[PDB]
């Protein structure tokens, strides 16, 4: 099936997704650390394939860019 | 048997530069006390430093604000250099509101009765548009030593500032001959201190001496 | 096959620490071994440390 980017991710607590918006994308200016989820993505195996911060790369989110193909309904953050 | 030194003079050369004279001192004690007090003054003096900043409409430091000459990061660096003395409390929130073209300096910070700005001309930023306005809440905390933000463990927009709490900038000490009523083998110790203007030199000297005495209490009764 | 792409840009401030490589313009390179406290550094007659 088509992979989905959303804030609905299984087997993860609500606190670990407080930095994500309703679209499952990290806010601008969020102070992230190693392991934090930046973009929540699920594969319909749904498996947890979300983009996480690489280990020990604790930093600040300064820009988010969204690129969508024709025919795809772009999300609310988009 | 040993003559005990006393604080005999405080020459306030400037607001941030002073000289404290301890007299009389026996042989060797001048340099001993000078180095001990220098190390304690440079390492352990308490002071107030900016730790958190909240600028309206700003999400992070790696950004720009319309009508502001400086980057938000540069504004944070300037606020890191803001020298403030707080009375009766270990944490305060200052409010800075400014509008119109001109340098936004420490003098524009809202007056607080328990807060004294030692250098009102400290430039915080520059507004370059007549319709531009900046509003920030600055958190000032009392501490000691150097406390980086990264080693410090928040809504988006609250920017952490590395805290250099130490008010002492430079310490030098010179041991020279002292003129006593009947003795000639007595020295005097002149401690030259350059601070940020937020600590009294006599208060700093007594503070360092108290720290040294409390650290010496362990050796005084060895067991 | 790509439905969408989200690019996130992370800014990190790297502060100097032992293990970092410093150099002049003369080929004098080295690795920082210690972050010495200010009161431990050599200082001149005016109390200014290096």
UniProtKB/Swiss-Prot annotation, chain A:
Application of this enzyme or protein: Co-administration of salinamide and rifampicin or salinamide and myxopyronin suppresses the emergence of resistance to both antibiotics.
Highest taxon of source: Bacteria
Entry PTM: Acetylated on several lysine residues in the presence of glucose.
Ranges annotated as spanning the membrane: none
Family to which the UniProt record says this protein belongs: Belongs to the RNA polymerase beta chain family.
Record note on quaternary structure: The RNAP catalytic core consists of 2 alpha, 1 beta, 1 beta' and 1 omega subunit. When a sigma factor is associated with the core the holoenzyme is formed, which can initiate transcription. The rRNA transcription and antitermination complex (rrnTAC) consists of RNAP, NusA, NusB, NusE (rpsJ), NusG, SubB, ribosomal protein S4, DNA and precursor rRNA; S4 is more flexible than other subunits. In pull-down experiments interacts with CedA.
Protein purpose: DNA-dependent RNA polymerase (RNAP) catalyzes the transcription of DNA into RNA using the four ribonucleoside triphosphates as substrates. Resistance to the antibiotics salinamide A, salinamide B, rifampicin, streptolydigin, CBR703, myxopyronin, and lipiarmycin can result from mutations in this protein.
Name of the protein this chain belongs to: DNA-directed RNA polymerase subunit beta
Species of provenance: Escherichia coli (strain K12)
Name of encoding gene: rpoB
Shown residues in whole-protein numbering: 846 to 945 of 1342
Swiss-Prot record, chain B:
GO CC annotation terms, alphabetical: cytoplasm; cytosol; cytosolic DNA-directed RNA polymerase complex; membrane; transcription elongation factor complex
Post-translational modification: (Microbial infection) ADP-ribosylated on both alpha subunits by the phage T4 protein ModA. ADP-ribosylated on only one of the alpha subunits by the phage T4 protein Alt.
Keyword Protein biosynthesis in record: no
Keywords (A to Z) from UniProt: Acetylation, ADP-ribosylation, DNA-directed RNA polymerase, Nucleotidyltransferase, Transcription, Transferase
MF annotations from Gene Ontology: DNA binding; DNA-directed RNA polymerase activity; protein dimerization activity
Region span, Alpha N-terminal domain (alpha-NTD): 1-223
Entry EC no(s): 2.7.7.6
Gene Ontology biological-process annotations: bacterial-type flagellum assembly; bacterial-type flagellum-dependent cell motility; cell motility; cellular response to cell envelope stress; DNA-templated transcription initiation; intracellular iron ion homeostasis; nitrate assimilation; regulation of DNA-templated transcription elongation
Catalyzed reactions per annotation: RNA(n) + a ribonucleoside 5'-triphosphate = RNA(n+1) + diphosphate
Protein family (similarity comment): Belongs to the RNA polymerase alpha chain family.
Function (record text): DNA-dependent RNA polymerase (RNAP) catalyzes the transcription of DNA into RNA using the four ribonucleoside triphosphates as substrates. This subunit plays an important role in subunit assembly since its dimerization is the first step in the sequential assembly of subunits to form the holoenzyme.
Domain notes: The N-terminal domain is essential for RNAP assembly and basal transcription, whereas the C-terminal domain is involved in interaction with transcriptional regulators (such as CRP) and with upstream promoter elements.
Protein name: DNA-directed RNA polymerase subunit alpha
């Amino acid at each position: 099936g088509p992979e989905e980017i959303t804030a609905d991710i299984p087997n993860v607590g609500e606190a670990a997704l407080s930095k994500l918006d309703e679209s499952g994308i990290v806010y601008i200016g969020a102070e992230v650390t190693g392991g934090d989820i930046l973009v929540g993505k699920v594969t319909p195996k749904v498996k947890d394939s979300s983009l996480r911060v690489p280990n020990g790369v604790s930093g600040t989110v300064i820009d988010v860019q969204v690129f969508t193909r024709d025919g795809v309904e772009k999300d609310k953050r988009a | 048997e040993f003559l005990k030194p006393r604080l005999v003079d405080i020459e306030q050369v400037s607001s941030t530069h002073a000289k404290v004279t301890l007299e009389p001192l026996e042989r060797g004690f001048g340099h001993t006390l000078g180095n001990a007090l220098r190390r304690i003054l440079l390492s352990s003096m308490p002071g107030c430093a900016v730790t958190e900043v909240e600028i309206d409409g700003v999400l992070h430091e790696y950004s720009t604000k319309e009508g502001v000459q400086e980057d938000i990061l540069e504004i944070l660096l300037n606020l890191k250099g803001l020298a403030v003395r707080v009375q009766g409390k270990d944490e305060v929130i200052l409010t800075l509101n400014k509008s119109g073209i001109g340098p936004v300096t420490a003098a524009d910070i809202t007056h607080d009765g328990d807060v004294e700005i030692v250098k009102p001309q400290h430039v915080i930023c520059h507004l370059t548009d007549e319709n531009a306005s900046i509003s920030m809440r600055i958190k000032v905390q009392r501490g000691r030593g150097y406390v980086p933000a990264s080693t410090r463990i928040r809504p988006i927009g609250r920017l952490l500032v590395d805290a250099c709490y130490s008010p002492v900038e430079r310490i030098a000490y010179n041991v020279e001959a002292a003129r006593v009523e009947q003795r000639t083998d007595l020295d005097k110790l002149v401690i030259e201190m350059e601070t940020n203007g937020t600590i009294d030199p006599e208060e700093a000297i007594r503070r360092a001496a108290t720290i040294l005495a409390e650290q010496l209490e362990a050796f005084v009764d060895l067991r | 096959g790509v439905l969408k792409i989200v690019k996130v840009y992370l800014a990190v401030k790297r502060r100097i620490q032992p293990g970092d490589k410093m150099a002049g313009r003369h080929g004098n390179k080295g690795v920082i071994s210690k972050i010495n406290p200010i009161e431990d550094m050599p200082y001149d007659e005016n109390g200014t440390p290096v």
